[PDB]
Design a protein around this ligand. Structure first.
Ligand SMILES: [Mg+2]
Ligand SMILES: [Mg+2]
Lengths: 104, 104
């Protein structure tokens, strides 16, 4: 499914307990996902493939395959894919009740 | 941390919302994790490395790196590591309130 700066594929759609969601995300080639935070949800990310700058709060990380991150609620985050390869991650949302994104 | 047939490393210990837990598991070389089910918890597994037979209910899967599985509550499951390499997975527990394993 296309979302402009990224594509997403839901995993086990409807089979996870209320409050949880899982998906594959691919940040497109050379794309920035700009600064945003979630009001309620937590996000766990497992990096499958590619490389990107991943920003959480004041820190920017060199995200590489095998890395795992946690983005807590009301924590700004962003991604800069500087490569021609998609930046692919396995995403688990927790305390998730629908879109709660604030874009800056 | 050693658990006999597997080793585990908690991830973001204490930072996840109540009801959720994350860890790295490594099923040891050549080891079987025998049939068991959870009363309440759901388990999402991302296979990092190695190969194993993963049983869920009546189905046995050839689990390989990149595969993702969901084990629902009160669903029997088991793993047979036939390789000398550890079977390494990223595990997210949902609807998780403590050890609720029934071993058969
Ligand atoms: Mg986010
Ligand atoms: Mg289990």
């Amino acid at each position: 499914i296309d979302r402009g700066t990224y594509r997403k594929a839901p995993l086990f759609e409807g089979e996870l307990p209320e409050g949880s969601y899982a998906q594959i995300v691919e940040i497109k080639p050379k794309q920035t996902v700009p600064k945003h935070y979630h009001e309620k949800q937590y996000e766990l990310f497992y990096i499958i493939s590619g490389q990107a700058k991943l920003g959480i709060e004041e820190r920017e990380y060199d995200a590489k395959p095998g890395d795992i991150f946690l983005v807590k609620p009301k924590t700004v985050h962003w991604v800069v894919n500087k490569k021609e390869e998609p930046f692919r991650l396995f995403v688990i949302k927790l305390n998730y009740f629908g879109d709660d994104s604030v874009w800056l």
